[PDB]
Design a protein around this ligand. Structure first.
Ligand SMILES: CC(=O)NCCCCNCCCN
Ligand SMILES: CC(=O)NCCCCNCCCN
Ligand SMILES: [K+]
Ligand SMILES: [K+]
Ligand code: NA
Ligand code: NA
Ligand SMILES: [Zn+2]
Ligand SMILES: [Zn+2]
Lengths: 341, 341
């Protein structure tokens, strides 16, 4: 399968992440794409192409225009405000707060943010557009008739909502891909999120959209980021009722339990009538991933890919989470190998 | 007037504060109480006394018990979780999020927090309880017949809402004092927040209570912390409709303009029929304050104190903001001087 990848992902290289009460090197670092690209390549997927340039038309159908405008100039305004560190939100619109949007950069960053563990830095906006472009190019391949394609997106996007960034995400690549397929002729598209963390961002974008189905398997929000979304009870709202399916699971979950959730999610996706599935692939469910508590092994990733591919509909894999361990590449390569059959 | 003060305020000595994308020494540090206490004694207010022992009965009538329970063991759990730095929230329940409460320490801290700039540290809970004791003791002085008294609270409390901490606040001292006065036999009490920042926590606590009136003068939330509450349109709700009065003002506001808002706010308080007024005094409105944009001069605090005492009802002054310059003590003392007459 073709691999879409942009070298400009490296433009995203913030030096700080708020974690455990300290500012440390980001977990979502550039080396991630390097090892993944290397592993999938030696796995046989070496047909790598750079993404083409794309306007904001597609992304403007899933993200708030004010949010996008904010991101594009955030760093400039933050630096111009006299701040020494990187752009990190401190005040947030939580319970019982006014819905008004602030004017100052310090207020707007909080308004447009769901998590302070993600800082905006020079290049974030340009890197984010390159990652979005990889997703759009992968979608076009599927629309062109390709059975499978892999967009090595970075930074990831599943935690980015309609009008908020966080979880190392700014532009929801999987959401753009999905919208792009609809724009190309599809009437129903599904997004399957196997990243360890819930795709709060993606859920938000399609919560009231009936033409898109969202299924996510993730660590139980009651005890894993993002914490405030991902509960089984959330199934959609209004025009999008019944199009959201969450499968929260607890610590130590083995593939034997995870796989069952996967099987059920694919059953709901089949019933929905998805013409294609955008897969938000996160290999952070690995038993050896530092910030996660699932116990899947490398071989399970081959099963995962094979199973999703058995849906019989075209597949677009979009890269998301997966950290630390040098096996992130192997695990991503295994999913693709599983899809190839 | 008598001065209620506690040495256990020192137990709150956080080492980090997320400001400008960096972890720097907290603006709200112990030296603040030292400078203020010395200045009030200097001005003749040397009758300082330590607060008596008080239970949680009063505070339980204004704060959520789940929230209070959370604060008492937040630092312990945080450390047991293996985190190096101090307890700082990263994930927050923002727009379109679930109302569910997480079970993990990392999730609960975000759930019970409105601003990431405030960190929980060893001794914060005990420090917060002493500051609340001083407020209660001050309240009883007013209930006993005193025309005025000063509760030198630290940490501050006006940013602490019903079930959330932030803005250097954990327990709403002014709210507890107001509640205490009502428990002593009062039917209608008012809180006047002159601190530079909006009293978002105080507003939240009494938003739906008709027995308490809340008036606040503060930097326009569109460009001043907390950024998500403090607009003139917020006048109350349900059982407490019409009991909230916000006066947001722009950058560089001098006493010439600020004075008019004070006058109107006192007029509404009188029309409400307040039997006593708790005054949340923050001197961060000073032209030299490092994090505020108002332009009050030190003499203006004398005029302010006098104008408020001219209300003709008992006054309980509760310390809040005021940072950087040592003049904070002079400004606070000038208010007590204006009030004393
Ligand atoms: C795209 C993505 O997978 N992002 C991960 C979200 C960051 C989780 N925050 C770290 C806190 C752990 N204690
Ligand atoms: C009780 C009180 O006075 N709290 C003040 C809270 C300060 C907000 N953080 C500073 C934001 C400017 N960058
Ligand atoms: K997921
Ligand atoms: K105020
Ligand atoms: Na939907
Ligand atoms: Na009220
Ligand atoms: Zn993840
Ligand atoms: Zn203040």
């Amino acid at each position: 399968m073709r691999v879409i990848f942009s070298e400009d992902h490296k433009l995203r290289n913030a030096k700080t992440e708020l974690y455990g009460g300290e500012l440390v090197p980001p977990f979502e670092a550039p080396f991630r794409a390097e090892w993944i690209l290397a592993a999938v390549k030696e796995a046989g997927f070496d047909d790598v192409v750079a993404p083409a340039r794309h306007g904001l038309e597609t992304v403007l159908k899933v993200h708030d225009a004010g949010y996008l405008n904010f991101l594009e100039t955030a760093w400039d305004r933050w630096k111009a405000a006299g701040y020494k560190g990187e752009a990190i939100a401190t005040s947030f619109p939580v319970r019982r707060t006014s819905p008004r949007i602030p004017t100052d950069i310090e207020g707007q960053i909080g308004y447009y943010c769901n998590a302070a563990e993600t800082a905006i830095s020079p290049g974030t906006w340009e890197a984010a557009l390159s990652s979005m472009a990889s997703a759009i190019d992968g979608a076009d391949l599927i629309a062109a008739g390709h059975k499978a394609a892999f967009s090595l997106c970075r930074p990831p996007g599943h935690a980015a909502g309609i009008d908020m960034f966080g979880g190392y995400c700014f532009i929801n690549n999987a959401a753009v891909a999905a919208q792009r397929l609809l724009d190309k002729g599809a009437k129903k598209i599904a997004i399957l999120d196997v990243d360890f963390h819930h795709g709060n961002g993606t859920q938000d974008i399609f919560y009231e959209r009936g033409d898109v189905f969202f299924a996510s398997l993730h660590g139980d929000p009651a005890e894993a980021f993002p914490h405030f979304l991902g509960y089984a009870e959330e199934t959609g709202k209004g025009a999008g009722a019944g199009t959201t399916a969450n499968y929260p699971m607890g610590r130590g979950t083995p593939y034997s339990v995870w796989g069952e959730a996967l099987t059920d999610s694919l059953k709901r996706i089949a019933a929905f009538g998805a013409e294609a599935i955008v897969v938000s692939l996160g290999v952070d469910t690995f038993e050896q991933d530092p910030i996660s508590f699932f116990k899947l092994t490398s071989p399970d990733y081959i099963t995962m890919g094979r199973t999703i591919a058995a849906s019989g509909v075209p597949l677009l894999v979009v890269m998301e989470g997966g950290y630390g361990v040098p096996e992130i590449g192997l695990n991503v390569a295994n999913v693709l190998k599983g899809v190839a059959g």
